[PDB]
Design a protein around this ligand. Structure first.
Ligand SMILES: Nc1nc2c(c(=O)[nH]1)=NC(=O)N=2
Ligand SMILES: Nc1nc2c(c(=O)[nH]1)=NC(=O)N=2
Ligand SMILES: Nc1nc2c(c(=O)[nH]1)=NC(=O)N=2
Ligand SMILES: Nc1nc2c(c(=O)[nH]1)=NC(=O)N=2
Lengths: 121, 122, 122, 121
């Protein structure tokens, strides 16, 4: 693997963290990165699928990302600027034997695109 | 279609420009938009193609975009944040019978990712 | 100055445009750039002014920007992600003796954050 | 406080995490968000100070951000697009009594803008 997280120098900066702490830290980075990188992107039914695929594949690059699935909700025939409330993301981060499952989704009750941890394996 | 630029309300805001002025204005918006939307995006050989394709299809949504081709240069096995100097873009804007062909490419002599107009068809 | 648009290499890429065409092309670049760079940024009354000022100064770097004023509308005590429909921008582009005045503003009738040219000053 | 993270609904999504896990999760979001929001921004000596201040004030809005300091390195008279390797960020996240101190900085040895946790209190 040519991934930077495999290097000894990278690893030395995470000796103060548990594997669970590392997993959610890395998960947080990726969800925050995803949101801010892509919000604003013109999106319509025409490019929905290509956008979803590109976001998944782009973010897969980042440290410790094991798998990811991206859905864009409420996409219309007329294009709009992507907004955070339209994102529905499932993310898996793997740190050694620990897998964190994280979620980005719109929570109506707080009118907020919330990022959180679903569960650990 | 449902495209915003077809509405009479949209059109009334551009009665003060020539078709060449409009084409170049719209082309400028789209090149600025794509640079600033996508710079920063993680890119490797893994996602080079889906990223190129998604940029093309996203930008096609915008007013008056006739066609667009996006190439990301110097992509390796190891990922990097997309930077503007890696972009090589050919864009076509159509206003009535006027077509502006615009370019985004790296100019080594000024170390600059330059946006310009390649040619018109009128 | 050290501004890239002052170099001969840069200039040689714009021989095919009138000054008005060049002004609106550069204006389109800056508006598209501003919109896509900053949409998404957390904004509340807390940081409204610093964001407005940072956007103005950042965009002043770009080729041929003469002046810019950025207002963010509908900012509350609670933060939101900056949305394009909240931007109200007046931009001046100067090419030799030509000044293009451009606008970004929300048009309720088409539910669209519209970029257009107000006027030229010659 | 009108902050969303103070609401009961928000809080119920984090019962599965320790305060340290929460702090690094929230810290990770803000650093990934900051990087991807601002990378690409035109920056020169002219607007360096206003850009740093705006980044600091913007990101302070986010859940659980206690304090933040943003420095942009190697800024010249001629503008460049902000590059992630130019960022030098110190970030404090507070969850109840737990404070996590996080860092974004360029690590020459792996040519990487690394995000990591410096320490907890
Ligand atoms: N738990 C969190 N969820 C978020 C967030 C954050 O800082 N924390 N920004 C966001 O858009 N969703
Ligand atoms: N002609 C121009 N080329 C540019 C630019 C601009 O404002 N004008 N930004 C950029 O990245 N390339
Ligand atoms: N005239 C235009 N106004 C726009 C636009 C575009 O491509 N053209 N995108 C946008 O957000 N506002
Ligand atoms: N520890 C990490 N540091 C990062 C990163 C990531 O996913 N993890 N992206 C980045 O630019 N710096």
């Amino acid at each position: 693997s040519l991934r930077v997280e495999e290097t000894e120098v990278f690893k030395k900066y995470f000796k103060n963290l548990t594997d669970r702490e590392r997993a959610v830290f890395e998960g947080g980075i990726t969800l925050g990165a995803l949101f801010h990188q892509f919000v604003g992107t013109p999106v319509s039914k025409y490019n929905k699928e290509s956008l979803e695929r590109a976001i998944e594949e782009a973010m897969k690059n980042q440290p410790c990302v094991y798998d990811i699935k991206v859905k864009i909700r409420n996409v219309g025939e007329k294009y709009v600027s992507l907004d955070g409330k339209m994102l529905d993301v499932d993310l898996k981060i793997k740190i050694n034997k620990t897998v964190a499952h994280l979620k980005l989704e719109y929570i109506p009750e707080i009118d907020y695109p919330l990022m959180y941890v679903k569960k650990f394996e």
